[PDB]
Amino acid sequence: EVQLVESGGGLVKPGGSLKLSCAASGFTFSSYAMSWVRQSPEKRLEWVAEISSGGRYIYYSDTVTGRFTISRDNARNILHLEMSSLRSEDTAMYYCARGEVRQRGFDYWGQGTTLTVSSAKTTAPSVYPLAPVCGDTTGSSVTLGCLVKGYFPEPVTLTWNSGSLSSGVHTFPAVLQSDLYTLSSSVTVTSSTWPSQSITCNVAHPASSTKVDKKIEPR
Amino acid sequence: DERETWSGKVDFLLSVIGYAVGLANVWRFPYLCYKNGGGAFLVPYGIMLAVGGIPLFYMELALGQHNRKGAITCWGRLVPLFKGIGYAVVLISFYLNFYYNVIIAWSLRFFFASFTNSLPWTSCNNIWNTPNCRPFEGHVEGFQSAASEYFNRYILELNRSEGIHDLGAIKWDMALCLLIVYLICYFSLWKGISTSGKVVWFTALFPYAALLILLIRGLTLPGSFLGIQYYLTPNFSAIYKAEVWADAATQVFFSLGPGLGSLLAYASYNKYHNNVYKDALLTSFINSATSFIAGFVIFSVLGYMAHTLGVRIEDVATSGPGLVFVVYPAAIATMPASTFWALIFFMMLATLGLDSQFGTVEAIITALSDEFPKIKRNRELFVAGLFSLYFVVGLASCTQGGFYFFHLLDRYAAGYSILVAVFFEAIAVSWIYGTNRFSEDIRDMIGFPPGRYWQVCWRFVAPIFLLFITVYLLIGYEPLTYADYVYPSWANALGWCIAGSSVVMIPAVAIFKLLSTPGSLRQRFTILTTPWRDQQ
Amino acid sequence: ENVLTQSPAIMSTSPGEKVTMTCRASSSVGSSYLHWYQQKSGASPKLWIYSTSNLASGVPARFSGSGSGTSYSLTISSVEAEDAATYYCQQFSGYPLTFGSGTKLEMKRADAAPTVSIFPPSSEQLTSGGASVVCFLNNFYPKDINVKWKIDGSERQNGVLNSWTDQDSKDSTYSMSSTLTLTKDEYERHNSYTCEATHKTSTSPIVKSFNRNE
Ligand SMILES: CC(C)CCC[C@@H](C)[C@H]1CC[C@H]2[C@@H]3CC=C4C[C@@H](OC(=O)CCC(=O)O)CC[C@]4(C)[C@H]3CC[C@]12C
Ligand SMILES: CC(C)CCC[C@@H](C)[C@H]1CC[C@H]2[C@@H]3CC=C4C[C@@H](O)CC[C@]4(C)[C@H]3CC[C@]12C
Ligand SMILES: [Cl-]
Ligand code: NA
Ligand code: NA
Numbered sequence A: 001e002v003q004l005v006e007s008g009g010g011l012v013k014p015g016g017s018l019k020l021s022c023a024a025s026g027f028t029f030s031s032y033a034m035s036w037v038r039q040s041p042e043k044r045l046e047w048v049a050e051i052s053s054g055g056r057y058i059y060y061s062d063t064v065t066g067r068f069t070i071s072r073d074n075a076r077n078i079l080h081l082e083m084s085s086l087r088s089e090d091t092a093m094y095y096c097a098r099g100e101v102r103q104r105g106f107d108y109w110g111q112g113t114t115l116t117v118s119s120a121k122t123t124a125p126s127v128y129p130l131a132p133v134c135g136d137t138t139g140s141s142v143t144l145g146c147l148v149k150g151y152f153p154e155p156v157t158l159t160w161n162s163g164s165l166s167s168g169v170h171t172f173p174a175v176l177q178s179d180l181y182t183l184s185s186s187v188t189v190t191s192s193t194w195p196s197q198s199i200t201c202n203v204a205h206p207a208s209s210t211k212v213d214k215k216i217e218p219r
Numbered sequence B: 001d002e003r004e005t006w007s008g009k010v011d012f013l014l015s016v017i018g019y020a021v022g023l024a025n026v027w028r029f030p031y032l033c034y035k036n037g038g039g040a041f042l043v044p045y046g047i048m049l050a051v052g053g054i055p056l057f058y059m060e061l062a063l064g065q066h067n068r069k070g071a072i073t074c075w076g077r078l079v080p081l082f083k084g085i086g087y088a089v090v091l092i093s094f095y096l097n098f099y100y101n102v103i104i105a106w107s108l109r110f111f112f113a114s115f116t117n118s119l120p121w122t123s124c125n126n127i128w129n130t131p132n133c134r135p136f137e138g139h140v141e142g143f144q145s146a147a148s149e150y151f152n153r154y155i156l157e158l159n160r161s162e163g164i165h166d167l168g169a170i171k172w173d174m175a176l177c178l179l180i181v182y183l184i185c186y187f188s189l190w191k192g193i194s195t196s197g198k199v200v201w202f203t204a205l206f207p208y209a210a211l212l213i214l215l216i217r218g219l220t221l222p223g224s225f226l227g228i229q230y231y232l233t234p235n236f237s238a239i240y241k242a243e244v245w246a247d248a249a250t251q252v253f254f255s256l257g258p259g260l261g262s263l264l265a266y267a268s269y270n271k272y273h274n275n276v277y278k279d280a281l282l283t284s285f286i287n288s289a290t291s292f293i294a295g296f297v298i299f300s301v302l303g304y305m306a307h308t309l310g311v312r313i314e315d316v317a318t319s320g321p322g323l324v325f326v327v328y329p330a331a332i333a334t335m336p337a338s339t340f341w342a343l344i345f346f347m348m349l350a351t352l353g354l355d356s357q358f359g360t361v362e363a364i365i366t367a368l369s370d371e372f373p374k375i376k377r378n379r380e381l382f383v384a385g386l387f388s389l390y391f392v393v394g395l396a397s398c399t400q401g402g403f404y405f406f407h408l409l410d411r412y413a414a415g416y417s418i419l420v421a422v423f424f425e426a427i428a429v430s431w432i433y434g435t436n437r438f439s440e441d442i443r444d445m446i447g448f449p450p451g452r453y454w455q456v457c458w459r460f461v462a463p464i465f466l467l468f469i470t471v472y473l474l475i476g477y478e479p480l481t482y483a484d485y486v487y488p489s490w491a492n493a494l495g496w497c498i499a500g501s502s503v504v505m506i507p508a509v510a511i512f513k514l515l516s517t518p519g520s521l522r523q524r525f526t527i528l529t530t531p532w533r534d535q536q
Numbered sequence C: 001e002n003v004l005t006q007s008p009a010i011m012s013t014s015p016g017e018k019v020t021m022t023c024r025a026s027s028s029v030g031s032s033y034l035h036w037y038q039q040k041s042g043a044s045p046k047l048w049i050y051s052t053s054n055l056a057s058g059v060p061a062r063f064s065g066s067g068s069g070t071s072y073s074l075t076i077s078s079v080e081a082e083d084a085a086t087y088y089c090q091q092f093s094g095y096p097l098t099f100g101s102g103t104k105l106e107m108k109r110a111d112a113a114p115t116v117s118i119f120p121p122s123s124e125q126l127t128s129g130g131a132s133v134v135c136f137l138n139n140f141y142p143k144d145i146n147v148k149w150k151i152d153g154s155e156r157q158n159g160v161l162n163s164w165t166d167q168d169s170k171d172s173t174y175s176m177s178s179t180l181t182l183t184k185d186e187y188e189r190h191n192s193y194t195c196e197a198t199h200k201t202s203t204s205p206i207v208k209s210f211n212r213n214e
Helices: B009-020 B029-035 B038-067 B071-078 B084-096 B102-112 B146-155 B172-186 B193-203 B206-218 B224-232 B242-255 B262-268 B276-308 B321-332 B338-369 B379-398 B402-410 B415-446 B452-475 B489-503 B505-514 B522-528 C123-127
Strands: A003-007 A010-012 A018-025 A034-039 A045-051 A058-060 A068-073 A078-083 A092-098 A113-117 A126-130 A142-151 A157-160 A169-171 A181-189 A199-205 A210-216 C004-007 C010-013 C019-029 C034-039 C046-050 C063-076 C086-091 C103-107 C115-119 C131-140 C146-151 C154-156 C160-164 C174-182 C192-198 C206-211
Touching: A003 A092, A018 A034, A018 A092, A018 A113, A034 A078, A045 A068, A045 A078, A058 A068, A126 A199, A126 A210, A126 C123, A142 A157, A142 A199, A142 A210, A142 C115, A142 C131, A142 C174, A157 A181, A181 A199, A181 C131, A181 C160, A181 C174, B009 B193, B009 B262, B009 B276, B009 B338, B029 B038, B029 B224, B029 B242, B029 B276, B038 B071, B038 B224, B038 B242, B038 B262, B038 B276, B038 B415, B038 B452, B071 B084, B071 B262, B071 B338, B071 B415, B084 B338, B084 B415, B084 B489, B084 B505, B102 B146, B102 B172, B102 B321, B102 B338, B102 B379, B146 B321, B172 B338, B172 B379, B193 B338, B206 B276, B206 B338, B224 B276, B242 B276, B242 B452, B262 B338, B276 B321, B276 B415, B321 B338, B338 B379, B379 B402, B402 B489, B415 B452, B415 B489, B415 B505, B489 B505, B505 B522, C004 C086, C010 C019, C019 C034, C019 C086, C019 C103, C034 C063, C046 C063, C063 C086, C115 C192, C115 C206, C123 C131, C131 C146, C131 C192, C146 C160, C146 C174
Parallel strands: A010 A113, C010 C103
Antiparallel strands: A003 A018, A018 A078, A034 A045, A034 A092, A045 A058, A068 A078, A092 A113, A126 A142, A142 A181, A157 A199, A169 A181, A199 A210, C004 C019, C019 C063, C034 C046, C034 C086, C086 C103, C115 C131, C131 C174, C146 C154, C146 C192, C160 C174, C192 C206
16 A cells, blocks of 8 residues: 655765655555655664655754755655755664654655765775684584675675575674775575585675675585 | 733633623524424534634634734734724724623613612512503403513603604713723723723623523423424424525624624734634634533523413414513512523623623724734723723713614614624635635644635635525515614615625725725735735 | 653563553553554554553454553463563653653573684784784573673783674574674784683583683
8 A cells, every 4th residue: 555665865975965765656646744754774663854744844853953965856756855965963874754743753664765975985895704613513404605705885685695694604793994895694494405506696886887796515 | 921811721712701701692593492393493503603704703803812913913014905894803803892782881770780689570560550451461462461561661761752863852861870981891891801801700701600500590490391392393394495594694693793894903902823723613602502501590580470370372482672671570570589580681682792892992902002002001091091082072972862863873883883794704715815824823823724624614604694694684674663663764875875884994904005005916916915915 | 842761771581471561651651552562673653552451453362452641561371482572651641742761572592601702813914903802602591690800810801892682582592692803913912812701500600711822
């Protein structure tokens, strides 16, 4: 029925500008107030701006007032948020939330669109294979790894054997350390599976036209 | 801006419930039930109340609170092409008080005349009686009761007036009582809401005290239940008739008194986020609830007259000023401890009228204050000059033919004028302004949009409701005649001018405003149909 | 700004048990204006409870809400593993609209020792001036775990990158990757590298080590 997708997003230099958009579907968009509410990477939900059903009543937060501007296109059913004079404290996932009646809260939420704001530059990762130490005990279970170091920005997609290996896989979240992200994943497979059947980690970084396969081979 | 606000939400509730409940709650609603199928009359009365009355009542309270301005400003602030609606409405309220204050005066005269051991209106052997005097009400015209003769030969002296041309001498005892009414209103409205919302604590709450002590008194009389039978015995054959549906429709509309700028005035002083929806439903219910109770206060003793006094129910079940000024006092004259029931009854009438008149004259001063700031700054000076004009020409209602004057204005000056005004009120907010705009406005105030039921009522059934009422008022029209007196044709023509003078302000202002802004035609309507708030 | 704090910040609980979490406004809010939002890991929030106590469409009757004024609470009658999420209270009473600090709900579980795996830097990273030794500690409970890197017996503290995974939805365990990064030079000047895991499941640490020769 009702649906909300958020468009735009990406990374911007501090002081830059960007405009996000929310395509509303499955309901009469013109008779529902809309609102933008973000949450930072530290998972803090924070309401940004509300626009009335007719765009004639608009409220902002103190942290974005003047910089941000909200608008409606009830012809094509699009909710917009124009951001200017961006600071680093504005990097967050941005949610487009339907919420007319205040007493009944925010009915439906979008998927969210993500915004980054840094002076840091875009970097593609150098993905490494992680084979076990040389000539050790089988143990009926062997853990292979895949190191994805020094990229920017988020996100990256890591998957094993084109996504056919979804059991015994642990993809760890990326840690930002001095303007670079490092990520790692681990797969445990039975000793009769490797290296008899080869294992590969598929790293993809669309922010830098990156699509790298990497085989896990012993030494 | 920083507009004045009520010094308490109950001050607003009391002064609205006060304004809403009046003499049409006691001397019209119970008759209708009796005349139109007893308790079965509540079916069309309630449906007409839910789909036609409460919608219009709710709508004006929102526009008052949302636009934070008086009558003429709000409509100019809302749709400038129809800014004349504020003027016409204020003119109607300006006309009403020229005569409908005399009911509070007659009530104060009976109050003054009740400080006696035996009330005067009980005996047929006074200097003001005729040989045709009867102890109680009958059905032949030439023979009236002792209370009818007392009212029409001592208090009114209407027997000394040949008609509207013959106003005759001026009863100075009545001119004093009308002066007292305008004194009661002044030192309760000159300082504004500070005192208005507080003086109404007495005028709006007292009638419930009186209705209580008069309900236990009426329900414990010999023959009370017989009236409750007449008042409520259901005869569902009425519901089929169209006239009773219009009786229910027209009573529902006027008993809430919309389209008079008063609700628009009182609500404008509310906080912007007050739950005006909750206030509309609460106050409107208490209006009909007070009417439901009053019918027992009336028809209990109305049956007591048929039982112990031997009177046809048809000869005493009346409506209007006849019910409160001849028949009910005649029944009080017979019950033990008579003088007490008279005083609590007659100041029930006064406290019923004052709180209602408050809103009408308040609708004037708020609207005029919000438009002419040098009289917003001189309220106690301005409102001291308004009642001055009221007392001058109001001397016509104290002349020996003053009732002929009162009855003429009652049946012309404000009836039809307020129907076409609300009809343009209803379509200006629904079509020109837009339900989408109006719903979006009160969502900002109360947090939720009005239901689809509320705006489907504001958009389609509200004009049909007012059209239904106007059609039935015009269908049953006749030239004006009171008792055996037929008014001259020029007197009827005078009443239509009073009717048109207000409502002509809609097209006259619409004309004067249209050809006073530049541009093309469609380039001008978008000027006169863009609201003040939309253009900031 | 009506700041709303929530307690506890993160609570674990066994299935079948009951949980209560509170939401403390700094200024009184009307009952009809406080709402609750459940947000599962890697997903957008969802309206869970509106007007203190009214359940949204879909949320089961084992959830309930109560409170008034400055103190509010969310309660789950009998917790299930499908309720492992973060719960946010929100006030719609006045602008600015504000969301609570959030209460993370996790599932209690029997303890579990971590399976430690050490990895030397691959030959690809070694060509460039780089050398990162990675240590995996997978499928353990509770979440707290500690690592020490020993380079030839003497612990090395600086230059590591730790990452904790979310609580698994199968075995409800955790997993932590630690990555010590060296230059190719200072790496090739040391022969034995060690990764010790100090967990609650053992007095002594589960140590894994290797030598740059093999
Ligand atoms: C004679 C006296 C003593 C009693 C008169 C009865 C009225 C007071 C009752 C009877 C029918 C009731 C009405 C029936 C229907 C409605 C529609 C109803 O609309 C809704 O259900 C809410 C819509 C929404 O916002 O979602 C609001 C109450 C209302 C106006 C009620 C208001 C009070 C009414 C007029
Ligand atoms: C006539 C007898 C039998 C019953 C009369 C009913 C009276 C007692 C009822 C009906 C309307 C009521 C009032 C309606 C509204 C309000 C405003 C509210 O915010 C405070 C109480 C107050 C002022 C109520 C006091 C009691 C009240 C006056
Ligand atoms: Cl009524
Ligand atoms: Na009244
Ligand atoms: Na009335």
